[PDB]
Subunit: 64 residues, 6 copies
Amino acid sequence: PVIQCDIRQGRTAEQKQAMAEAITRAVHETIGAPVEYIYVLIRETPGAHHVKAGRTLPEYTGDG
Amino acid sequence: PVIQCDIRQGRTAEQKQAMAEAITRAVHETIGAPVEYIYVLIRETPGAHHVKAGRTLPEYTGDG
Amino acid sequence: PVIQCDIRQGRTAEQKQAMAEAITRAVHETIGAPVEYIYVLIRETPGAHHVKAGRTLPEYTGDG
Amino acid sequence: PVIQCDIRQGRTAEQKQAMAEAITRAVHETIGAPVEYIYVLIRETPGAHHVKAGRTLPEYTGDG
Amino acid sequence: PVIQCDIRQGRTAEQKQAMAEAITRAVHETIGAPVEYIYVLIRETPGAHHVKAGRTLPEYTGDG
Amino acid sequence: PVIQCDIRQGRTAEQKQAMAEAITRAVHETIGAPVEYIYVLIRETPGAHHVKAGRTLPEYTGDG
């Protein structure tokens, strides 16, 4: 399967790889797709390019 | 974030919901996206519509 | 530009055409894309294939 | 619903937000999707990455 | 790479496989992507779901 | 039809245009879509954003 992830910019390389590995496991385990068939694609955009219910999303920083 | 999942047809409603929930948790935990921001979208296609490295994928049946 | 619209199944042909025309006008008027460059693509899915903030969306019926 | 907008780079932040708000209204009004379900995603690319009928599209500047 | 092909319904299984193979060869030969990395995904929609320059596309029948 | 090409960064403008023209011909010839209906969209990402079978893809350089 193809899993496309349009996420906000600002995560580390390690966070994005952790996401891709967790999604790969999740897909394999829940729908029985072989790992060899799984293709995860990550695309980053600014928060302003995510407009949900008419409102832009804030920039991600991980500050909390 | 938007997570699009192009998977082969033939899974049960329970399998697809399990996948969507597991992806939601995976994205939340690895990149810190609030659950409220996550949108998972599932599309089903025949196996013949997945052509990886020049080869058609088989149909998913749940059997093996 | 390409505008992909993943919507829930159940709308009439007239509703979907109205949406495509309104999006075409909206894109033309707000960002100055010539109408000739605009391509709107509509895909329908069951409500269960839309999982937002962990929750499945209901089926669209036209009633309420 | 998910509305993905692959547009050419070069618009202002205000033009892109106007587009996302107009698309949100257009979708809500034509197919009856609640605003809370609507997720607009904007991606920018160079004109050379839009190849329509075999021809690349020019860069957008808004000059006219 | 991922190559998504949103085409109008009505083609034979042989036509769609021919398209996927020809795209695989085209991508391999022009940008040097190894065949092993290429994933082609085909989705079919009614002609009415393709609205280009404000106009609906006709249904594909194989006749003319 | 819409053909979306998510490829790794690092190709020349000429390689990407050759790809788009070859895909346009391939689609026209195999499924009979008129060239005027064909819209190819190219998006570039780092190799680390392509995670296939759990493994990131290397950066493309064309060195061989």
